[PDB]
Symmetry: C3
Subunit: 90 residues, 3 copies
């Protein structure tokens, strides 16, 4: 019985983000080339996946957090985390 | 407890695909910048992972669906989901 | 019971790596345009995630292997797999 992780990265430094689901909550550890630190992402979830893409130099991250049959999308677009439009019928 | 997801994205629109393993089957939700919709992917599996790459504007997706110790690779190369050559001796 | 996988890919051949957690071990299957073959990676873990990035033509891979509350990072930077600096307090 283990924590569950999801990871994404970008650029050539690189930056890395690792999300960990643990006892119903998801937190984030970050690397920007100069040591690991705790990130701002903090949301409910028993399961996590992540994807990200660059528009020029700007990173955009989408985290999919699931509890039961409900998946919530969280969005990073250079400012804060916001709730995304994702829905599903589970 | 919960469904298990995998996500991939491409381009700068972006396009996003989210695969959800729910009670033994994997389904797909799709974003191409204009609203979420249900994709054609539907395959059995308790666990899912995904990767994708672009060739110019053409997306290629590989979904790894697992039940027990058998992982089946499903391929999108523009022309419907086809069974891939992946094997593993788990 | 059912194994858990994580997948990454790079280039446009492409190269693909699929990591499978089974019976407390994470193993690796590899594709680079010929056949699937078993990779060198083999480490303890009940859960796995992965990310990778190119610097020029050189691939760098990070595998996050979790057992219980402990996530260990394994790093490929062209010459072998080495333990990474990642830490967390789960
Ligand atoms: C500067 O903010 C850091 O990087 C962003 C890309 C996000 O991962 C955020 O949660 C983190 O704290
Ligand atoms: C612009 O809309 C935001 O970004 C898209 C890429 C999707 O993640 C969508 O659900 C989200 O609300
Ligand atoms: C175009 O429609 C959507 O995009 C393809 C790339 C696949 O994800 C397919 O299953 C889905 O229906
Ligand atoms: C051409 O072969 C197809 O694409 C490769 C990139 C692999 O995913 C392989 O297993 C699949 O059958
Ligand atoms: C050349 O070595 C192969 O490719 C590397 C990028 C790693 O995936 C390694 O485990 C594998 O055996
Ligand atoms: C040089 O540092 C290595 O690469 C970084 C991108 C991180 O994965 C770090 O934990 C690892 O030790």
């Amino acid at each position: 019985s283990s924590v569950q992780t999801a990871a994404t990265s970008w650029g050539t430094v690189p930056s890395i983000r690792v999300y960990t689901a643990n006892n119903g909550r998801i937190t984030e550890r970050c690397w920007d080339g100069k040591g690991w630190y705790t990130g701002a992402f903090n949301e409910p979830g028993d399961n996590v996946s992540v994807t990200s893409w660059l528009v020029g130099s700007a990173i955009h991250i989408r985290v999919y957090a699931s509890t039961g049959t409900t998946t919530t999308e969280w969005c990073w677009d250079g400012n804060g985390w916001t709730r995304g439009a994702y829905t599903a019928t589970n």
